[PDB]
Amino acid sequence: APEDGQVYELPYPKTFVLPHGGTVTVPRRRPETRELKLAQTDGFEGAPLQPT
Amino acid sequence: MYHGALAQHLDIAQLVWYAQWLVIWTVVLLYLRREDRREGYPLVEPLGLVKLAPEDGQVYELPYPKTFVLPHGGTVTVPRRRPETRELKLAQTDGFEGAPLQPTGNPLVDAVGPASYAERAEVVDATVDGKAKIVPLRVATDFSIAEGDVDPRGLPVVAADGVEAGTVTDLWVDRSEHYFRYLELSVAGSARTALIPLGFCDVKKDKIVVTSILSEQFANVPRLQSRDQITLREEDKVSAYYAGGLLYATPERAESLL
Amino acid sequence: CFEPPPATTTQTGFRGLSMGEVLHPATVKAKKERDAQYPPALAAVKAEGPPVSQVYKNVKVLGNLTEAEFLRTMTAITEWVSPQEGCTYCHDENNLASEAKYPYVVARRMLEMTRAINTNWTQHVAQTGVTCYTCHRGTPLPPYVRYLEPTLPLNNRETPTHVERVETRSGYVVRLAKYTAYSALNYDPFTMFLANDKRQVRVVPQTALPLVGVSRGKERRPLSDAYATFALMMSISDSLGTNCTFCHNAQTFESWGKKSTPQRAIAWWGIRMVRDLNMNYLAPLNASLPASRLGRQGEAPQADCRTCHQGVTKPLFGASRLKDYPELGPIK
Amino acid sequence: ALLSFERKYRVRGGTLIGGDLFDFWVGPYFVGFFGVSAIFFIFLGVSLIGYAASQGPTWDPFAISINPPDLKYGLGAAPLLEGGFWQAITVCALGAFISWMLREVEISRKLGIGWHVPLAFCVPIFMFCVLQVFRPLLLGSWGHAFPYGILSHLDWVNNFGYQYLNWHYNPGHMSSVSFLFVNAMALGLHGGLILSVANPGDGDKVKTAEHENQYFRDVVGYSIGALSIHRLGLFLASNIFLTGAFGTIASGPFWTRGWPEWWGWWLDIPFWS
Amino acid sequence: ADYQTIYTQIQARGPHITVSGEWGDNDRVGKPFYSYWLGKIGDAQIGPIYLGASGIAAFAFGSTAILIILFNMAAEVHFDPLQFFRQFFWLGLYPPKAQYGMGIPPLHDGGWWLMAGLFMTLSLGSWWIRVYSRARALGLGTHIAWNFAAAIFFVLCIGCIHPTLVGSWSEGVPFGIWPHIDWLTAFSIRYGNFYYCPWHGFSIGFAYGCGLLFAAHGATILAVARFGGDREIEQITDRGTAVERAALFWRWTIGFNATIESVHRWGWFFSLMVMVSASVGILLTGTFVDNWYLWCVKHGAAPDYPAYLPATPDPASLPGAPK
């Protein structure tokens, strides 16, 4: 599932044509690929992470 | 050179592939999936002590309201906020949200689970020209039982428990569709009739067999306000009653089949 | 109207593609037994004495045979083609060099044709080769031949019903259907494809997009060409008692490489071969044949795939007499 | 989480097997014993597909193909990579389908409605078995079943048809196709009518049951009626496979010639030959 | 069990109903009568039927089309009656076998085909008017007329728009039982395997989907027949336990659900899209794609398999190979 709601809440994409060349389009899928040195301090979702 | 070529690699049929997919998901998500939400939305839940929100998502997923102008006067507009105000005799069997509820009284009478009706209009469904649509043959006199079929008027009704529960007294016909929808019976040892929808009825030559409920439970079949008329909400009540028998007529019936 | 299991099935393509033969055992056995009537090789004779070119009066083709060899060939020819009639079918009783009877002169050309097939069309017939028996099957008129019209029954040893008679116009669509494996394809693949080399069998494009300049209006071949190629392939399939996947991966009929089996490339040669035979040996024999032999446009009976194969992927199930009768080729 | 009307329906009971143990919902989904097994099998089958797919020459969606064993392995077990995976995935698919079917009976039971839907769902499960199980069994080899690939499964359908020269003349297919076409038309008609009545246009009134019937009496001289069009529709759809199955089973085990030729039983009645 | 979902146990007879339209009410010709056996699984009243101008027009054109087909078919068995009846399936009326381009073909080579094609078209037009009108007369929306339009358009696509687009009448669909079937294979072969045409895939998707959806819908309604679920119009304007239960069955099974109205929209849409996707596929074929398999190969979609028997070079390309 892509939830219906995830579709409904987004706007249509917009694209800035950049001044020194290029474009950028937002919204766009931008995952954080970087590995993070953090640990679940506790169990639940609201729990803060802790640097390892 | 080629018909269809647009670039080093781009051809018409290739771009129509994409257009075809956009057209499909647009219609499906933005149109049909919202038409799907004209009943039952917004979703109900508890909330918190301090919480201000119509969620944006609850707005986004709904369509604009539509209004049917009804044939014999009135309008109906959907979607619309339609809370279930009725008190329900059910209890949390367990803690979590996914847990099933359990009747605390008589589910057939409390009308819960398979015995629930909808909050339909207390209006008599009408034929196109304004008459009451579903009426006993005592009333629908230009109507008849096709030559060949059983006339159940006079036959015993026999309940799930093998016991005779009453005597068929009339059939109610659908005058818009020329189609019987209930039998009416004199309840044995009661001073009442009950209607029973024709789908709960095995019609034999010599008896009408009804397995949903035991003979004892015809006593509490829902009662109509008139004798020769029935409202939309009443039909729901009568039907749901027997449907509830399938799960609830005896203690075995809710449990594992095997 | 059905055939009881089991069915014999083979695999001719990568697994999961549903490519291969589906055979009914009783049918295969029945053809097996029919093809089993191939007379065996006459015993070999010792090569004693003069080439019959010295010895006999009028030997053109087999002139280099010693006498005993030559007479062995004549005995074989007689049991392959005209066993019920004996030697006199082609010969004058009292003069063996007489070309008086047309079977004689036809048989001479047939010796040349036969040696052509085994020498020049090894890419089709390979080291199995053919003999007079392959087509004739022990009668002068081979049981499966083609005219410039569809004719019925396919086996001419059978007797026509009224409707089957080529003259009976109302039986045409049936004559055509039984030649194309019971389809309604309104084309005769024999006169279109096999009688000569005028038409092209391939109809499917080899580019994804339509090439500008062959793709519009009168530039383009009519779709009827596609039906004809389909008709020819129905007929080829019925002739060899097989189905398309013997030769094609239906994923892409028009591709070769891994999309075609070796039997397809062999079938390609057989088409070239059949055209050669028809154009250069068989169609000319209308000059030497009785009117009773000729079709309604004065054509000699000619050859298609069935003439040899007669319902089997290899004629006579691959039986061969090539080593036994090298007279008949290959001629080095 | 709940539809506005839903809560009154969320009662215990109706399970086939398991009782209270898995009688609950996760979100909108009822679980039940068979939801647990459905999930078990999906996860299994899908894991097998991922591995099998990684062992092969592509991660392109359209080109990925997981194929049955060579004919020679017969009805026996084939090495994992040469059909073994396909045999495994076939067992998981079957377990997923039947679980899904049985989970639907439990849902029907809890709701107090008829079991017609899981019943209707048996028809496609059946056809899946005709193609993958029965027909391979009659022919003696798992290798006759179809590959699991988006496009490759179309190459199998193609070749299977052309094995019988022209599959279009297969009388079981003819019946099958006819029901596919009628059923599509009828769904258009039924959908269109119910919408035409509930949505007359402008600000006109919603119409009636009497109108629905009048429309088709007018257009074609007959109207089957409201309940009956749903019974007809379940019938036309179901026969797409129930008739088709005969055409599929007959090909190979009962008929080895081209399908056009089968029509010889007609053409060659000797009284008009 | 609910036996009513199998058949009508006790049939009702009552005086027949007539819903007055804005016009043409005088054209309803015929006496209703009642089949008892039909009444077991449907409404028992057969008839009356509306005539009208467009309907009559439709029957006129349609019958003319049929006369040209059957007359040419009779010509094919040389007007033998028994051979006609015997060979009927195999008999056909064909388009140009020769390439006349967009030239009007001779009568003997596709001329009659084009004629019958024209009358059939007028026949479909007239019928469309009838199907559209009756809705308007009776105060109904025109959803059916629009689903029908898509279907007619498809027929035009395979009948003359594609032939026109590529500029040859040779490509149209024969009339006849086996002949219109053979065309399917001729056309797929010519265009490089229709399995590799995306819109062929779309169309089948929606066609299978109509099967799924009408199986699931028809079943869903019989399963709540006990609650009057068949009375779909008033279940729309006044939701009842029928369609509350129908919705919840589907929600609990697949996680989302329609309403009793929207499910007909899904159905309609799926139906429509069979014909729409089909048309698009035909408009693209020959015009812009010549070999659908190669087009897939060009775009990377096609599966490929190992050789099983040895890979076989095209003999025609071998050096020294004949022609």
Ligand code: BCB
């Ligand atoms: C692109 C694909 C094509 C295709 C593919 C195809 C295949 C692959 C097959 C057929 C088959 C068939 N096709 Mg072909 N086809 C046919 C006709 C036919 C039939 C001979 C047959 C069965 C069809 C069927 O059951 O439909 C469904 C039937 C319907 C919708 C009938 C409507 C009934 C109506 C609602 C009843 C109304 C009630 C009464 C009138 C009441 C009367 C009482 C009143 C008067 C008081 C027509 C007439 C046309 C066109 C366009 O004119 C057409 C186009 C095409 N076919 C395309 C070229 N066709 C099958 C066959 O057997 O071939 C030999 C088959 O296997």
Ligand code: BCB
């Ligand atoms: C060259 C080959 C040809 C061919 C070969 C062919 C074969 C070999 C067979 C058919 C069959 C069939 N063909 Mg034919 N065909 C058809 C139409 C049809 C179907 C009506 C019918 C049944 C399909 C089927 O088995 O589904 C099967 C569908 C199944 C089993 C669905 C299973 C679903 C499962 C229960 C659940 C799956 C769940 C997903 C995994 C879940 C995903 C989860 C996601 C969504 C969350 C048409 C309309 C045409 C036209 C217009 O030409 C045509 C042409 C041809 N067919 C060609 C001539 N066709 C079959 C038949 O019945 O023939 C008589 C058959 O065996």
Ligand code: BCB
């Ligand atoms: C005998 C003939 C057969 C046949 C003939 C056929 C043809 C000729 C065509 C398809 C097409 C399709 N087939 Mg195949 N088919 C498919 C699935 C598919 C889809 C890839 C696609 C669209 C189907 C559709 O929309 O249906 C209606 C169902 C709907 C709308 C509900 C949504 C279903 C969802 C799209 C299914 C998606 C399944 C996933 C891709 C499968 C993988 C599942 C994951 C979890 C592992 C399944 C799951 C099965 C099984 C399990 O039996 C099956 C069996 C068969 N198909 C038979 C072998 N099918 C079309 C295609 O485009 O091919 C690529 C097409 O052209």
Ligand code: BCB
């Ligand atoms: C070997 C040949 C193949 C082939 C060739 C083929 C072609 C050439 C075409 C299709 C098309 C289509 N095929 Mg494919 N096909 C299909 C299924 C389908 C359909 C979904 C779709 C056609 C739409 C349709 O409903 O026509 C039936 C519906 C029709 C004809 C509408 C008729 C409406 C009309 C108003 C009715 C009029 C009735 C009147 C009574 C007429 C009166 C006439 C009188 C007056 C003479 C399946 C399910 C399969 C499988 C399972 O293998 C398959 C295999 C194949 N097809 C093979 C690959 N198929 C079409 C397509 O989608 O291409 C993109 C197409 O044109």
Ligand SMILES: C/C=C1/c2cc3[nH]c4c(c3C)C(=O)[C@H](C(=O)OC)c4c3nc(cc4[nH]c(cc(n2)[C@@H]1C)c(C(C)=O)c4C)[C@@H](C)[C@@H]3CCC(=O)OC/C=C(\C)CCC[C@H](C)CCC[C@H](C)CCCC(C)C
């Ligand atoms: C004649 C009647 C018909 C009919 C009827 C009904 N149809 C139903 C019902 C009824 C009545 C339901 O009640 C049930 C349902 O819930 O509806 C929403 C259902 C459903 N019809 C689906 C697909 C569908 N119906 C098809 C055909 C017809 N339906 C015919 C036409 C086709 C065709 C034609 O291709 C498809 C693909 C699913 C969406 C759904 C099952 C979900 C499932 O079972 O979840 C359980 C399983 C999964 C979600 C995943 C399983 C994955 C396995 C382990 C791994 C994959 C294996 C696989 C073999 C790979 C092959 C891929 C390759 C070929 C490419």
Ligand SMILES: C/C=C1/c2cc3[nH]c4c(c3C)C(=O)[C@H](C(=O)OC)c4c3nc(cc4[nH]c(cc(n2)[C@@H]1C)c(C(C)=O)c4C)[C@@H](C)[C@@H]3CCC(=O)OC/C=C(\C)CCC[C@H](C)CCC[C@H](C)CCCC(C)C
């Ligand atoms: C995806 C959706 C699809 C879809 C949709 C829709 N399909 C519709 C509608 C919708 C929505 C309608 O509204 C319209 C209709 O009205 O429905 C009741 C209709 C229709 N779909 C028919 C056939 C069909 N749909 C097919 C396919 C699909 N449909 C696809 C699948 C197929 C296939 C599969 O091949 C077929 C064969 C007809 C029943 C009907 C048109 C009648 C016509 O156009 O008549 C034209 C008129 C004539 C032929 C008149 C001549 C007839 C007489 C008997 C000839 C007598 C000869 C004699 C010599 C003279 C004596 C005269 C006598 C009186 C003394």
Ligand code: HEM
């Ligand atoms: C049957 C066993 C048989 C005999 C006997 C026979 C003999 C024969 C001889 C001796 C010759 C050479 C005679 C001469 O000087 O020309 C000869 C030549 C040919 N034959 Fe013969 N023949 C017998 C049978 C048959 C049959 C059944 C046919 C016709 C199908 C046939 C044909 C021919 C032909 C032609 C020649 C010429 C061969 C050449 O190399 O040109 N014979 N025969």
Ligand code: HEM
């Ligand atoms: C092999 C060397 C050989 C001989 C000998 C032979 C003879 C022959 C005769 C006698 C005829 C005329 C028959 C008649 O009465 O008209 C004849 C005719 C045909 N043949 Fe033959 N034939 C030999 C070999 C072959 C081979 C290998 C083939 C098939 C490729 C073949 C085919 C035919 C056909 C066809 C005819 C013409 C039709 C006819 O006149 O009967 N023959 N052959």
Ligand code: HEM
């Ligand atoms: C089975 C009925 C069948 C079909 C279908 C079929 C089709 C087919 C096509 C579409 C072509 C054209 C290829 C192109 O346009 O490039 C074609 C060509 C050849 N075929 Fe075929 N074919 C069917 C069956 C068979 C069988 C059983 C064999 C092998 C014995 C076979 C062989 C060939 C050959 C060779 C060609 C090429 C013709 C040439 O180049 O002259 N086919 N086929």
Ligand code: HEM
């Ligand atoms: C007609 C155009 C025709 C076709 C097609 C055809 C095909 C064909 C195939 C596919 C093979 C190979 C089969 C295999 O399993 O390897 C094959 C083999 C032979 N053929 Fe043939 N053939 C056609 C026509 C003809 C004709 C007219 C004759 C007889 C003159 C003939 C002969 C043969 C022979 C001999 C073989 C066998 C080769 C072997 O290895 O045994 N064919 N044919």
Ligand SMILES: CC(C)=CCC/C(C)=C/C=C/C(C)=C/C=C/C(C)=C/C=C\C=C(C)\C=C\C=C(/C)CC/C=C(\C)CCCC(C)C
């Ligand atoms: C003149 C110029 C320049 C341009 C005109 C362009 C034009 C409009 C051309 C149109 C061509 C068209 C529309 C061609 C379409 C062809 C197609 C789609 C044909 C398809 C199928 C044909 C079939 C199956 C024919 C079957 C056989 C028959 C007609 C025999 C009679 C049988 C009956 C009618 C059965 C009736 C059964 C009924 C009573 C229930």
Ligand SMILES: CCCCCCCCCCCC[N+](C)(C)[O-]
């Ligand atoms: C269980 C079904 C048995 C087949 C009944 C055949 C009924 C004839 C079909 C006419 C359909 C007419 N319509 C769509 C106007 O209602």
Ligand SMILES: CCCCCCCCCCCC[N+](C)(C)[O-]
């Ligand atoms: C190939 C035909 C494809 C048809 C697409 C069918 C869409 C199925 C419905 C998806 C609904 C998904 N949801 C809940 C996220 O909205």
Ligand SMILES: [Fe+2]
């Ligand atoms: Fe409906």
